[PDB]
């Protein structure tokens, strides 16, 4: 039940808690080899500087991840990178420093083919989370056979990443590797849900109280109560705005320029396990976990409003009892349950909180239903017949006329051309609808990574983006609006390109833009990198299906003006043909725009061009 869902047993949880306790006594991290498991526990810290960085000028100590170090932690189609707590990130970076021997120990554990486990209590858990992601980006994605799955186990950990963080974990199917135990009242998982200005004065004393290594010499009750109230007020704002933004308020004055009621960007990442005296409740849905983080820490189970802050401090230290009493607790998985009332009542969630958690779960169910309808629509034969007609009928018939379907559509002198236009419009409608669903976060996290969708969208892009470029230049939109690559390319094609590129490139750790610039620099054109990036600004040589676009921007101009761009296009063309991005039966035809333009190029260029064998008869 629990083991079938999380992939860890009670022995591993117990060893993880033992190592997390031991990590207090070791600098940065502690390594423990226990049978078939190797555990990396991280030393937690209770200094204010280790929750909100002193040099961070943002309201929540947040910072955007660097796309080179965490290339998967982003939205593929949109491009937006994930955001994490800067202090936890700096702690991770200080651990992974080559001078710490952490990386060498991790690689030695990888060679042993044992189950590698990153664990931690409090901020250590935070580091553990990041460490796991580090592993996932540096080893597991490169070769999942020699770099095996990690496990991440945290006890009372603060939130680490934002919604894009959790989304990227979900798309890569990495969230299943994370298990975050949270005792019902533990205040630490709720801290970074508050504006750092709301707790800036009371956080040091409460952190000293939360430190398991310190003695409680009966300090200050008032500061603890005020800290709890601040954290709960800001958490309430965040959770209620999540409720309103999920299906109620949409977008009214949500956007920036009005930094009035700033809400924390941090969201639950991975599986969470709430714990009472009698239950273990596992939750996957991040929005549900946020709503529960708010509503389980309320004065509701007995309405003992006066005692709940000290319970919130003591529950950060109650993971020993949690680990000792796991086997005697009743387990249930909230996401897959038919009725969530017993679990949330046992957790003290009010009726309104229960309705909000149910609403979050229902929204995830709606996203799954949307993906199901999308796959049924894209798998029926009446839909695929359009692409099949473009592939097996329109393209060969246009190759027979010796001009290619791009030019045949651009002139549109036959009825087949208008038929192709109709099918292009229908396909565009379907893909624009899917894109609109993606933009509004109304599909599962895994959608953009689904290999069936990637295959279909790549086929559609390769087949139909030439027809959309022909439609763009046929209606002279290049003169009214501008070049196709700058102000005319439909976003659906960008999404399809980015999904395909990420899928095929992520095992090597480089993003498509860096691969492109590496290839153009390997073309050895002999110019400065900034100058080349300026010449290839908004170029069509970054994606094969944009070939014609670049051609349209290069024909008519003198050779000295666009020599760099034409050589770059020619250098990309052969790999494009091999990959299937550009049809070699189309572009070299006698009536093709590209061939008619390529003949006009200087004969000295054609002599040393890689394409002279494809157009011998000029």
């Amino acid at each position, epitope marked *: 039940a629990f083991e079938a869902l999380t992939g860890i047993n009670g022995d591993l949880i117990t060893r993880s808690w*033992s190592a997390s*306790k*031991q990590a*207090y*006594l070791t600098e940065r991290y502690h390594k423990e080899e226990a049978g078939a498991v190797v555990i990396f526990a991280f030393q937690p810290s209770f200094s204010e500087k280790d929750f909100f960085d002193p040099d961070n000028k943002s309201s929540f100590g947040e910072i955007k991840l660097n796309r080179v170090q965490f290339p998967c932690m982003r939205k593929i189609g949109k491009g937006d990178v994930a955001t994490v707590n800067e202090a936890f990130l700096k702690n991770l970076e200080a651990v992974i420093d080559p001078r710490t021997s952490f990386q060498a120990s991790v690689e030695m554990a990888v060679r042993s083919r044992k189950q590698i486990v990153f664990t931690g209590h409090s901020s250590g858990g935070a580091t553990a989370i990041l460490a796991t992601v580090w592993y996932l980006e540096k080893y597991f994605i490169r070769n999942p056979n020699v770099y095996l799955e990690p496990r991440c186990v945290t006890f009372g950990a603060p939130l680490v990443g934002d919604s894009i963080f959790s989304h990227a974990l979900g798309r890569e199917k990495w969230s299943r590797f994370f298990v975050n135990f949270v005792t019902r009242f533990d205040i630490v998982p709720r801290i970074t849900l508050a504006r750092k200005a709301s707790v800036e004065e009371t956080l040091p004393h409460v952190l000293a109280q939360l430190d*398991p*290594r*310190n*003695s*409680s010499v009966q300090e200050s009750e008032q500061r603890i109560t005020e800290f709890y109230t601040s954290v709960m007020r800001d958490t309430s704002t965040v959770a209620n705005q999540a409720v309103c933004e999920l299906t109620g308020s949409a977008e009214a004055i949500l956007e920036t320029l009005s930094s009035f009621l700033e809400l924390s960007p941090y969201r639950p990442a991975g599986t969470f396990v709430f714990s009472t005296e009698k239950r273990l409740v596992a939750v996957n849905n991040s929005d549900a976990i946020l709503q529960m983080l708010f509503y389980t820490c309320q004065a509701s189970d007995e309405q003992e409003w006066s005692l709940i802050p000290f319970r919130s401090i003591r529950d950060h*230290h109650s993971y*020993e*009892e949690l680990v*000792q009493s796991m086997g005697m607790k009743l387990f249930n998985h909230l996401d897959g349950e038919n009725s969530i009332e017993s679990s949330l009542n046992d957790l003290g969630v009010s009726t309104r909180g229960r309705q909000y958690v149910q609403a979050a779960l229902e929204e995830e169910k709606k996203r799954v239903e949307n993906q199901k309808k999308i796959i049924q629509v894209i798998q029926q034969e009446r839909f695929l017949k359009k692409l099949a007609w473009i592939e097996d009928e329109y393209k060969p018939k246009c190759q027979a006329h010796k001009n290619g379907y791009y030019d045949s559509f651009k002139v549109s002198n036959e009825e087949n051309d208008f038929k192709a236009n109709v099918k292009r419009a229908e396909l565009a409608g379907v893909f624009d609808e899917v894109l609109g669903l993606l933009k509004k976060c109304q599909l599962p996290d895994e959608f953009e990574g689904d290999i069936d969708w990637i295959k279909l969208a790549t086929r559609y892009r390769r087949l139909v983006e030439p027809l959309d470029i022909a439609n763009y230049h046929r209606h002279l939109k290049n003169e009214d609006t501008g070049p196709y690559m700058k102000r005319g390319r439909p976003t659906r094609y960008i999404y399809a390109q980015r999904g395909y590129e990420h899928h095929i490139l992520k095992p090597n750790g480089m993003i498509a833009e860096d691969v492109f610039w590496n290839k153009v620099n390997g073309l050895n054109l002999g110019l400065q990198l900034e100058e080349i990036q300026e010449t290839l600004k908004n170029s069509g040589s970054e994606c094969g299906s944009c070939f014609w676009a670049e051609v349209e921007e290069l024909k008519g101009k003198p050779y000295e003006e666009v020599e760099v761009r034409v050589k770059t296009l020619e250098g990309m063309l052969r790999e494009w043909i091999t990959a299937g991005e550009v049809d070699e039966k189309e572009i070299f035809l006698e009536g093709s725009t590209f061939r008619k333009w390529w003949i006009t190029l200087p004969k000295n260029h054609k002599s040393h061009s890689p394409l002279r064998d494809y157009m011998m008869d000029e």
Partner: nanobody
Amino acid sequence: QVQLQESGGGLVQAGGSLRLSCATSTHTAGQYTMAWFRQAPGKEREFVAVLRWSDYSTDYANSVKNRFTISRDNAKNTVYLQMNSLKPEDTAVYYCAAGWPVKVISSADEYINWGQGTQVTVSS
């Protein structure tokens, strides 16, 4: 759950010494705060000595400080309380307890695991 078993109690003349042992089922160094408590007939379970998980530091109740000694053999997984200058009022059942994080050493509620206890009777 740590298993704790006390042994070594018995009858001792006033002024004598006696060593009590507490076998633990797992290593407790940097893992559990280990304490000795005692309960006399009718009275309540009061604190005697502590060895902290945090820093390996020892502390004692004022009635036993500088005459009792708490220690641990980490190899044998054993915690000892050596008692000296015993008085008839030290007659009690002695327990060893394990807890975490035990931010209040003298409170019995901080300790999650306990032993069955061993009787110590000091005669006049």
